DNA sequence: GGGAAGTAGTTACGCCTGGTCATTAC
DNA sequence: GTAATGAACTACTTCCC
RNA sequence: GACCAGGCG
């Protein structure tokens, strides 16, 4: 037989062979191999206005990753070099152009059209296939999984958008009317079109088309595509007698009123109202051609197929009305497809190439018109080569990848990579985001779904408004690529399916769909689906094909596109799983791998469609004859960070969510090459440790090699108030011995920029004469070349690099001091100094500062069970209680926090950790398979202690034992990066905004806090008017304004003769002074900017 | 990075007996008997050796000069 | 103003002046990245 | 006239981190 | 070298056959 | 200075 401990061996090979970032690398490889060629072949060629010239496109190739120096040479590039020098890791692109003269092709030529960024560790990157020591020699961490870009020295990652199905038909119903709306999205060359057909109280079918405001009737739009005879419409749509009667009711609006061209006249009248009569026909024909179901083609010949598809949509609409089909569910995962890098990059490349071809056309036309035909035909190769500007492609791709604003209005496609530690980066590389708007409630979209089982982690999600709309992939999830569709269609046509054109559907015949479109009918689909799936199991066809059927409507669905999310399962036949013990043995030895298991037919992938027909058993001892599949490992449905929590089934869901989210913030050894690596911020834990109680998944995924957190001796006891309300108490001697000690990094950058002309910057110790020269104390440890010596102490406002800018035009002959200095509220020691050259010849220096941080009051500590707090008091060792066996607690936690949160897993982990430490072996706590509690309690009883986990302690001050036994154990704890040293802030006086003369904003620039409106309301509610006057006016902008009393305008004061007079009216005696806030003066000025005139009436006192 | 010199909780010196424990546990001995032989009675000290990672050896490959 | 520098990947000393040098490259390696070596001064550090 | 139907207006408060801009053809 | 721009809600207001 | 993305209560 097979026990759950055996399936773990098989499950390990999946991660050992495939990895964790497959959905990026596979998609990018598919894009590289085929996407570029398809995009190039879409355009065809260039048609300039030259009388006898035309260019045809050939092949496209991608070169090696290289960089070109400004002086001309081109040399190889490596990722660390690109990161340090703030360059872009890209490779050149080559294209073949075939000149055509007078209709005869010439010999081809090859030109470079630009550069393309390269995904790290892809099939074309320089790091592909290298060994561990090769990566070590190159400065890379072998644990790095890859799958991100390097843009201008920064690391960018592309998240996956959760779009809707690309060609399916979805029906629904709204309550504001009786409309039975069926809407589809049609995709062709990146263009999205929305088409809807529906009925209403009139009973007449109506159609909505983009760029057509009026909902033209159904028969009118059908007759525009031909088949005017009334028999043709009914034959096209359906054959049910009730449907026949409904259609006879529908026809009378257009059956004997219009013909094929008359409907064209109506459409032309609507699309072009009041325009030229001939204009209307062409406009209507254009709209019909390339705005109605574009995915069926834009040629005028495809109108019959378009009419058939529209008739099918209308048939679905009317079938909803009679209650022959339940309404579709939008949140069901069979209706949603993911967007990966290979398609977003395809769209971006498409738009960039579309710009480039037009630019080339313009350049060629202008050059030929100016120079003349003799120059163009003298050397055609040179004429083609020198007319290409390869920057419009590179710059447009790079800017879009850098900013993150995709063409088409989408935002947030590209994000900065989170490099706090291992778990943060690994979880960030597996994100899934929704395109909905954040502010709206979206009650239906944020809820969990039954189809999410095995495809989406149910516990890892943000906490704010982003809850529900951002999710993470599960561990068993597998994304799919796309296979060619023509081969699949011609294979499907060869086993009994008749074409749709030859035979009309009828209620006794099954329907067959391929990727959402109808292709034919068959007399028996129950045998067809079995044959197709058996062929897939045998190995005749690819495994990306999934087949499902619904007998209520007599339909069969076949899917072969990319973007689906699938999970693996074990095939069960005749109540016996197909996996045997010898298979597990062969996998363990190494003779058999996961791919071979897939090929042999033991394990198959199921998407959301096939799972409708399945009946999955959970445990190997629960299978019977009815079951069709066996679950591999239930513990793997959780995401990556959510799998760290030991005994996750003993806690409340919000606490598990808090722990999973908080596991991405703890300090620890992130990557091995942190010393060389240049980052804006960084952290390091001095003595990381492996958790004593852990899940077996973390060992497999490599978490044990980059841990984060330490084990504490925790006693659950109520101390003297200082640990109340989620506060913790820490021992002092433990801190003095290295517990929870960490270091903080920060990098500064300076550049010797070049200006317009001979003006330039310079690295130099500033002279006392130059403007803005700081005190000579600050330039204390700068070497004469202008750079600071390493390993020298620095305080706030100290200068790291001395730079003198050219003089600012009004000050002549006076250089400006623009040195780079440490932040005003930081402190540390210089660690390393790097000198290098940028991509255009300018010098560049980078300096890092190292600071040591010891725990103090306010620092945030948190376990992995969702319990968080801050240090309340630090206690000397001799004051802490001690157990009668010789143990002194390392941490104290209030017992009031346990019952409300109901985190029993923390107590379980404490008992297990103490038992593991006593026994000298780690304890397994992997979800539903870990060691049971009673076994741990019995083992603890055997080892000599008490089964309840309690002990006897003595008071550390009085010196006598307490009246109650105290729970005590060992618990894993983590230190978050929200330290108090980065939050303290105070302001008395400082810089102000230029426009409003109010204090600036932000801790970084000595800003001030904001006194919001509810604070004003609170002050009003107390009744302190003078406090309001002081806070809102005295400590903010305040000014004196001269006001003309006779006319109400603001007077003018002249410094040249100390005379004050009103400009609009000649008044010089009634001028008075008023005290008001500057912001109100700006408001008065802005009101006077418009034609509104505010008049002021003064009063005494 | 490297083995701590002293146990955090009680200050006992355990920094010189990690390699012997690792070698004798890699030689197939019973970990509990090895820890008892080394003289570590309180589990606050056994926690130090039982859960340590030697991360020093795989970070010396990167030199900063 | 002559100062000592060390190559990023070879570690061997490179001697040049930053004021007038137009390109930064180790004469031994194609690399353009250089370090600034630590001075020879007895830095004093507390043991807390 | 009193039924559409099509505008027009809103959707909690702080704080922190980092990254990008701010034209071009001749 | 520079001159040149390229999703929900709710209550009103307007129809309207 | 304005935008974008991610976090904290
Ligand atoms: Zn006046
Ligand atoms: Zn100890
Ligand atoms: Zn060198």
Q: Closest Cα partner for A832 from B63, C26, C44, C46?
A: B63
DSSP assignments along A396-431, one per residue: HHHHHHHH-B-TTS-B-SEEEPP-SSHHHHHHHTTE
Contact between A468 and A201 (Cβ < 8 Å): no
Instruction: Count Cα atoms within 13 angstroms, Cβ side, for A318.
Output: 23
**Phi/psi of residue A100, each to 5°?**
-120, 120
B32 contacts A886? CB cut-off 8 A: no
Pairing mode of beta strands A555-559, A510-514: parallel
Q: Which nucleotide is nearest to A405 (CA to C1')?
A: F4
Question: Between chains, do A673 and B8 touch, taking CB under 8 Å as contact?
Answer: no
Q: How far apart are the first and last CA of chain A?
A: 99
CA atoms within 13 A on the CB side of A425: 18
SS3 call for A320: helix
Distance CA A330, CA A163 (A): 11
Q: How far apart are CA A712 and CA A706, in angstroms?
A: 19
d(C-alpha A96, C-alpha A86), whole Å: 32
Collect all residues with Cβ–Cβ distance below 8 Å to A581 and sequence separation of at least 6: A1, A2, A6
Whether A413 and A404 have beta carbons less than 8 Å apart is answered as yes
Contacts 24+ apart (CB under 8 A), A5-11: A5/A929, A6/A581, A6/A584, A7/A579, A7/A620, A7/A632, A7/A633, A8/A633, A8/A696, A9/A584, A9/A587, A9/A588, A10/A579, A10/A583, A10/A584, A10/A587, A10/A594, A10/A597, A10/A632, A11/A632, A11/A633, A11/A636
**Rounded to an integer, what distance in angstroms lies between the CA atom of residue A166 and that of residue A336?**
8
Residues of B in contact with A733 (CB under 8 A): 11
The ligand whose atoms approach the alpha carbon of A1061 most closely is 1
Distance, in angstroms, between C22 CA and closest chain B CA? 24
Solved by what technique? Answer: cryo-EM
**What Å distances lie between residue A177 and A181, A199, A200, A201, A1095, CA to CA?**
10, 10, 7, 8, 54
Residue A917 to residues A647, A904, B15, B47: CA-CA distances in angstroms? 18, 20, 18, 5
Inter-axis angle of helices A341-371 and A392-403, to 10 degrees? 150
Tokens linked to A554? 């007599």
Is there a contact between A529 and A554 (Cβ–Cβ < 8 Å)?
no
The CA-based angle C1-C6-C9, given to 5 degrees, is: 150
Say yes or no for a CB contact (<8 Å) between B59 and A713.
Answer: no
Contact A921, A913 (CB under 8 A): no
A1065 is in an annotated binding site: yes
Active centre residues of A (catalytic)? 726
- Cα A1047 to its chain centre, rounded Å, is 61
- 3-state class (DSSP) for residue A809: coil
Question: Please, which contacts does A98-104 make with residues 24 or more away whose CB atoms are closer than 8 Å?
Answer: A98/A55, A98/A56, A98/A57, A98/A58, A99/A53, A99/A55, A99/A380, A99/A381, A99/A384, A100/A53, A100/A54, A100/A55, A100/A56, A101/A52, A101/A53, A101/A380, A102/A52
Inter-chain CB pairs, A–B, below 8 Å: 87
- Kindly list the protein residues whose beta carbon lies within 7 Å of any strand D atom: A 151-152, 154, 366, 399, 402-403, 416, 439-440, 464, 680-681, 746, 982-983, 985, 1001-1004, 1007, 1009-1010, 1012-1014
Strand F nucleotides where any atom sits below 7 Å of a protein CB: 1-2, 4-9
Please report, for residues A27, A1094, C12, the alpha-carbon distance to residue A187 in angstroms, rounded to integers and kept in the order given.
Answer: 19, 56, 59
Name the pairing type of β-strands C34-35 and A816-817: unpaired
CA of A161 to the centre of ligand 2 (A): 52
| Contacts of range C43-48, beta carbons closer than 8 Å, 24 or more positions apart | C43/A791, C43/A792
DSSP H or E stretch at residue A968? strand A966-975
* A657 in Cβ contact with A461 (< 8 Å): yes
Comparing every residue's Cα with the C1' atom of nucleotide E7, the nearest one is A440
**Cross-strand bridge partners of residue A188:** A191
Tell me the C-alpha to C-alpha distance, in Å, between residue A319 and each of A204, A246, A267, A637, A724. Answer: 14, 11, 28, 38, 64
Asked if residues A644 and A423 have their Cβ atoms less than 8 Å apart, the reply is yes
CB A518 within 8 A of CB A500: yes
**A199 vs A247: CA distance, rounded Å:** 12
**A175 CB and strand E closer than 7 A:** no
| Å from the A445 CA to the D8 C1' | 28
CB burial readout A687-705, b (16+ within 10 A) else e: bbbbbbbbbbbbbbbebeb
Distance CA A504, CA C18 (A): 83
Report d(CA A895, CA A872) in Å as an integer.
Answer: 15
Centroid of ligand 3 to alpha carbon of C7 (angstroms): 4
Query: How far from A656 is each of A425, A463, A633, A663, CA to CA, in Å?
Result: 20, 12, 20, 10
Write phi, then psi, for A435 (nearest 5 degrees).
Answer: -85, 5
3-state secondary structure A1030-1076: HHHHHCCCCEEEEECCCCCCECEEECCCCEEECCCCCCCCCCEEEEE
Q: What is the CA radius of gyration of chain A?
A: 37
Where does residue A468 fall: left (phi above 0), alpha (psi -120 to 50 degrees), or beta otherwise?
left
- Measured over all CA atoms, what is the biggest interatomic distance in chain C, rounded to whole angstroms? 46
Resolution of the experimental structure, in angstroms:
3.5
Nearest ligand to the C-alpha of residue B9? 2
Asked if B61's CB is within 8 angstroms of A734's CB, the reply is no
Q: What are the phi and psi torsion angles at A924 (to 5°)? A: -85, 130
Give the E-state strand segments of A810-895 in sequence order. 816-817, 820-821, 828-837, 843-853, 860-862, 868-875, 882-883, 891-893
Q: Which two tokens stand for residue A450?
A: 């039954």
Closest CA to B44 of A1090, A817, A737, A122: A737
List residues bridging with A793 in a β-sheet.
A829
Half-sphere exposure of C17 (CA within 13 A, CB side): 6
Contact A790 C36 (CB under 8 A): yes
From chain C residues 1-40, the ones with a CB under 8 A of any chain B CB are: 6, 11, 35, 37-38
Tokens 């037989």, residue located: A1
Phi–psi pair at A22, nearest 5 degrees: -60, -35
Interface test with A, best of C9, C21, C33, C45 (most A CBs within 10 A): C33
Å between A87 CA and D4 C1'? Answer: 62
Of the candidates A428, A476, A469, the residue with the CA atom closest to the CA atom of residue A159: A428
Q: Say which residue the tokens 């769209």 belong to.
A: A347
Question: Residue A929 has which token pair?
Answer: 């398979």
Calpha distance A329→A164 (Å, rounded): 12
CA atoms within 13 A on the CB side of A65: 23
Q: Within an 8 Å CB–CB cutoff, is residue A596 touching chain C?
A: no
- Closest ligand to Cα A1062: 1
Instruction: Tell me how far apart the alpha carbons of residues A701 and A404 are, in angstroms, rounded to a whole number.
Output: 30
């Amino acid at each position: 037989d097979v026990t759950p401990d055996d399936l773990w061996i098989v499950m390990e090979s999946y991660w050992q062979e495939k990895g964790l970032v497959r959905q990026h690398l596979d998609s990018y490889n598919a894009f590289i191999e085929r996407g570029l060629q398809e995009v190039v072949n879409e355009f065809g060629g260039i048609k300039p206005d030259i009388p006898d010239f035309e260019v045809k496109f050939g092949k496209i190739r991608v070169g090696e990753p290289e960089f070109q120096e400004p002086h001309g040479q081109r040399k190889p590039l490596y990722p660390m070099d690109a990161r340090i020098r703030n360059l872009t890791y890209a490779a050149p692109l080559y294209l073949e152009m075939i000149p055509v003269i007078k209709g005869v092709e010439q010999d081809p030529v090859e030109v470079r059209i630009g550069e393309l960024p390269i995904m790290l560790k892809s099939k074309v990157c320089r790091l592909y296939g290298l060994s561990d020591e090769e990566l070590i020699k190159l400065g890379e961490d072998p644990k790095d999984p890859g799958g991100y870009f390097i843009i201008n020295g920064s690391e960018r990652v592309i998240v996956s958008i959760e779009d809707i199905a690309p060609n399916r038909t979805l029906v629904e119903k709204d309550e504001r009317q009786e409309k039975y709306i069926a809407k589809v999205f049609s995709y062709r060359h990146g263009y999205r079109a929305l088409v809807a057909v529906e009925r209403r109280k009139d009973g007449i079918l109506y159609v909505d088309i983009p760029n057509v405001p009026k909902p033209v009737k159904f028969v009118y739009v059908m007759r525009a595509l031909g088949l005017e005879r009334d028999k043709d419409i009914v034959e096209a749509v359906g054959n049910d007698p009730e449907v026949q009667q409904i259609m006879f009711d529908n026809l009378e609006d257009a059956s004997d009123i219009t013909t094929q061209q008359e409907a064209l006249e109506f459409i032309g009248k609507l699309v072009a109202p009041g325009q030229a009569r001939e204009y209307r026909l062409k406009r209507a024909e254009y709209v019909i051609d390339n705005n109605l179901l574009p995915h069926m083609g834009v040629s005028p010949e495809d109108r019959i197929k378009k009419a058939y598809y529209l008739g099918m949509m209308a048939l679905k609409v009317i079938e909803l009305s009679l209650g022959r089909r339940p309404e579709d569910d939008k949140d069901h995962y069979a209706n949603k497809r993911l967007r990966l890098a290979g398609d977003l990059l395809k769209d971006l490349f498409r738009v960039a190439f579309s710009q480039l071809v037009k630019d080339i056309q313009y350049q060629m036309t202008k050059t030929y018109q100016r120079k003349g035909d003799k120059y163009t035909f003298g050397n055609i190769h040179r004429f083609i080569r020198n007319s290409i500007r390869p920057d419009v492609l590179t710059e447009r791709i790079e800017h879009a990848l850098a900013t993150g604003a995709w063409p088409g209005g989408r935002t947030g496609v590209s994000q900065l990579l989170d490099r706090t530690n291992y778990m943060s980066t690994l979880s960030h590389l597996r994100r899934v985001t929704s395109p909905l708007d954040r502010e709206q409630p979206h009650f239906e979209a944020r809820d969990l779904h039954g189809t999410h089982w095995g495809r989406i982690c149910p516990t890892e999600t943000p906490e704010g408004p982003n809850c529900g709309l951002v999710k993470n992939l599960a561990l068993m999830a597998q994304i799919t690529t796309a296979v060619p569709e023509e081969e699949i269609r011609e294979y499907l046509m060869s086993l009994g399916i008749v074409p749709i054109e030859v035979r009309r559907p009828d209620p006794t015949l099954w329907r067959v769909y391929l990727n959402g479109v109808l292709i034919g009918t068959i007399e028996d689909g129950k045998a067809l689906v079995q044959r197709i799936r058996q062929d897939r199991r045998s190995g005749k066809i690819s495994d990306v094909i999934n087949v499902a059927y619904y007998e209520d409507v007599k339909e069969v669905y076949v899917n072969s596109d990319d973007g689906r999310v699938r999970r693996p399962l074990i095939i069960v036949e005749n109540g016996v799983p197909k996996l045997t013990k010898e298979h597990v043995q062969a996998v363990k030895e190494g003779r058999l791998k996961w791919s071979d298991l897939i090929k042999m037919g033991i394990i198959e992938y199921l998407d959301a469609e096939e799972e409708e027909n399945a009946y999955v058993a959970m445990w190997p001892w629960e299978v019977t004859e009815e079951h069709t599949h066996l679950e591999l490992m239930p513990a793997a449905i959780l995401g990556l960070p959510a799998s760290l929590v030991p005994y996750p089934e003993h806690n409340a869901a919000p606490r598990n969510t808090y722990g999973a989210g908080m596991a991405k913030q703890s300090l620890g050894l992130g990557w091995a090459n942190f010393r060389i690596r240049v980052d804006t911020r960084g952290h390091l834990l001095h003595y990381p440790q492996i958790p004593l109680v852990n899940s077996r998944i973390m060992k497999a995924v490599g978490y044990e090699d980059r841990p984060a957190g330490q084990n504490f001796v925790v006693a659950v006891l109520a101390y003297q108030g200082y640990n109340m309300e989620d506060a913790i108490i820490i021992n002092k001697a433990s801190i003095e011995r290295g517990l929870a000690r960490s270091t903080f990094f920060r990098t500064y950058e300076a550049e010797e920029k070049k200006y317009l002309g001979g003006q330039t910057d310079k690295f130099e110790i500033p002279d006392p004469t130059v403007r803005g020269y700081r005190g000579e104390k600050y330039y204390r440890n700068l070497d004469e070349d202008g750079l600071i010596f390493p390993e020298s102490k620095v305080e706030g406002k100290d200068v790291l690099v001395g730079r003198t800018s050219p003089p600012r035009f009004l000050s002549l002959q006076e250089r400006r001091e623009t040195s780079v200095a440490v932040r005003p509220s930081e402190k540390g020691v210089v660690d390393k100094v790097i000198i290098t050259e940028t991509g255009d010849g300018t010098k560049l220096v980078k300096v890092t500062v190292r600071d040591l941080r010891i725990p103090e009051l306010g620092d945030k500590f948190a376990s992995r069970h969702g319990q968080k707090g801050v240090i309340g008091l630090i206690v000397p060792q001799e004051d802490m209680p001690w157990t009668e066996s010789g143990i002194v607690p390392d941490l104290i936690v209030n017992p009031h926090g346990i019952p409300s949160r109901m985190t029993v897993g923390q107590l379980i982990e404490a008992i297990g950790g103490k038992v593991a430490s006593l026994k000298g072996r780690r304890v397994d706590g992997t979800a539903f398979i870990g060691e049971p509690e009673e076994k741990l309690r019995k083992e603890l009883e055997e080892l000599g202690f008490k089964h309840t986990g309690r002990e006897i302690m003595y008071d550390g001050i009085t010196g006598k034992r307490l009246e109650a036994d105290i729970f005590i154990g060992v618990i894993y704890y983590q230190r978050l990066h929200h330290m108090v040293a980065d939050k303290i802030h105070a302001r008395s006086r400082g810089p102000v905004q230029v426009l409003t003369k109010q204090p600036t904003e932000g801790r970084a620039r000595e800003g001030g806090l904001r006194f919001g409106e509810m604070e004003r309301d609170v002050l009003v509610g107390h009744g302190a008017a003078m406090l309001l006057i002081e806070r809102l006016l005295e400590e903010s902008d305040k000014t004196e304004v001269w006001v003309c009393e006779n006319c109400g305008h603001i007077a003018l004061e002249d410094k040249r003769r100390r005379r004050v007079y009103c400009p609009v009216c000649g008044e010089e005696e009634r001028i008075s002074k008023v005290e008001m806030s500057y912001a109100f003066k700006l408001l008065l000025d802005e009101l006077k900017a418009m034609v509104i005139r505010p008049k002021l009436n003064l009063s005494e006192r | 990075m490297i083995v701590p010199v002293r146990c955090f909780t009680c200050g006992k010196v355990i920094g010189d007996k990690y390699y012997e424990f690792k070698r004798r546990v890699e030689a197939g001995e019973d970990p509990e008997k090895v820890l008892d032989d080394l003289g570590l009675e309180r589990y606050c000290c056994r926690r130090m050796l039982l859960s340590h990672v030697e991360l020093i050896d795989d970070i010396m490959h990167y030199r900063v000069y | 103003v002559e100062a000592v520098y060390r190559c990023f990947k070879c570690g061997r000393e490179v001697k040049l002046d930053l004021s007038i040098t137009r390109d930064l490259r180790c004469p031994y390696c194609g690399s353009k990245i250089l370090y600034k070596p630590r001075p020879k001064v007895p830095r004093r550090v507390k043991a807390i």
